[PDB]
Amino acid sequence: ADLEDNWETLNDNLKVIEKADNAAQVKDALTKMRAAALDAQKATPPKLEDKSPDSPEMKDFRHGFDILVGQIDDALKLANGKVKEAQAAAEQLKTTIRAYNQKYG
Numbered sequence: 843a844d845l846e847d848n849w850e851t852l853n854d855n856l857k858v859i860e861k862a863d864n865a866a867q868v869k870d871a872l873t874k875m876r877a878a879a880l881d882a883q884k885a886t887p888p889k890l891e892d893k894s895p896d897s898p899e900m901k902d903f904r905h906g907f908d909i910l911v912g913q914i915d916d917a918l919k920l921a922n923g924k925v926k927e928a929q930a931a932a933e934q935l936k937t938t939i940r941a942y943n944q945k946y947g
Contacts, residue, residue: 848878859932868921868928883907
């Protein structure tokens with residue numbers, strides 16, 4: 843249950859931010875994101891061997907997870923004394939979940 847959990851983790855992560863109230867819980871929050879994000883890389887709950895395989899050696903698949911670690915990477919920096927900046931970005935991350943559905947869609 844590390845896959846169904848990561849989702850709740852990426853989700854339960856963004857909540858600790860807006861509610862972090864302190865830069866300390868922000869690192870800890872995004873620390874768990876960029877962490878499970880690198881784990882969800884090999885994510886395949888629906889099986890990518892039974893739908894659109896794309897073509898980029900699937901590289902384009904991990905790139906979406908690695909690229910994601912790129913925006914979360916710069917935010918992990920704001921964490922880590924820029925909370926409101928990190929928190930506001932959290933709403934940007936919430937939007938990533940939407941663009942991620944275009945990946946999971």
